[PDB]
């Protein structure tokens, strides 16, 4: 009477219908569910998410040490969203955002809504009011940790002191999620690891995607300062097989390196052969060293476009 796979599929189907698609899935699976996404500005990361970017209408948590590249990504995500004609909001509670650099990542600052809350309550509340106006494509919150409760902001008392910030973050997400789904706005919470910074206790559970951003390199070329290589681990993904990983370069002053990406993905996917210490494409000399090659590609814009083309086809081409 027993046939495992037939009895497993039936189980899984039931699992998914009781708790929503993505509740459980084979790791080696491949999802042709396109959803809707905001390209992360990182091709590797985009592929890593399995859907080409951050799904829309969901809670995304981007946690990681300072300087690791979290807000850069978040900023790119905002820029992409805006070019698709979407409206963006930035609930700033850190007062660290540098609009100039943001413009450089392609963000249209002037049309970017910014709000600098007085309390954690107000901040989440402002975000919630915006998000249920349905006019927003993406809303990023700086600093999960800067969401400190009012009672705490206003010299409270060492008594009746509580785990108040986490609860604040839970009640807030409880109602902001539904709204987020109806509206379709993607909400990116930036969580600096310095619970997951107190409020990330719930974030962990409410997020459909959670990125673990980490700094792994110092982008040196050969011997001087240009930027840093980042590594993102998709620790949680309710819309595609999780645990994938992506790497990419962020230069000082310049957002995620396109050419850099192309060179990397290009190589691992064959299209660009890498005789040790010399990069070459379709018989053309690219240069010695990731930078010379990066340069080559940035300059000969024609090449690196047929590459971007070739890599794009082999992975995620237009669907359904
Ligand atoms: N204002 C800026 N001007 C020029 N480059 C910047 C600026 N801010 C960040 N960068 C670049 O972005 C890289 C790191 O990205 P971040 O914005 O720090 O992402 P991240 O670490 O989540 O952000 P933090 O530190 O939480 S704010 C830095 O190493 C620089 O290369
Ligand atoms: Mg004030």
Swiss-Prot record:
A biological-process GO annotation: DNA recombination
Subcellular location per the Swiss-Prot or TrEMBL entry: Cytoplasm
* Domain of life assignment: Bacteria
| Observed effect of gene inactivation | Not essential in the absence of DNA damage, its deletion renders cells much more sensitive to DNA damaging agents such as UV light, ionizing radiation, alkylating agents and DNA gyrase inhibitors and desiccation-induced DSBs. 5-fold decrease in survival, loss of HR, no change in NHEJ (non-homologous end-joining) or single-strand annealing DSB repair.
Binding residues for phosphate, per the UniProt record? 67-71, 192
- InterPro entries recorded: AAA+_ATPase (IPR003593), DNA_recomb/repair_RecA (IPR013765), DNA_recomb/repair_RecA_CS (IPR020584), P-loop_NTPase (IPR027417), RecA-like_C (IPR049261), RecA-like_N (IPR049428), RecA_ATP-bd (IPR020588), RecA_C_sf (IPR023400)
Q: Which GO terms describe its cellular component?
A: cytosol
Keyword annotations of the record:
ATP-binding, Cytoplasm, DNA damage, DNA recombination, DNA repair, DNA-binding, Nucleotide-binding, SOS response
Q: What is its main location?
A: cytoplasm
GO MF annotations for this entry?
ATP binding; ATP hydrolysis activity; ATP-dependent DNA damage sensor activity; damaged DNA binding; single-stranded DNA binding
Protein residues bound to ATP: 67-72, 98-101
How does this protein assemble? Polymerizes non-specifically on ssDNA to form filaments. Interacts with and activates LexA leading to autocatalytic cleavage of LexA, which derepresses the SOS regulon and activates DNA repair.
Q: Its function?
A: Required for homologous recombination (HR) and the bypass of mutagenic DNA lesions (double strand breaks, DSB) by the SOS response. Can catalyze the hydrolysis of ATP in the presence of single-stranded DNA, the ATP-dependent uptake of single-stranded DNA by duplex DNA, and the ATP-dependent hybridization of homologous single-stranded DNAs. Numerous X-ray crystals have been resolved under different conditions which indicate the flexibility of the protein, essential to its function.
Q: Which NCBIfam families match?
A: tigrfam_recA
Name the family the entry cites. Answer: Belongs to the RecA family.
Descriptive protein name: Protein RecA
Gene source species: Mycolicibacterium smegmatis (strain ATCC 700084 / mc(2)155)
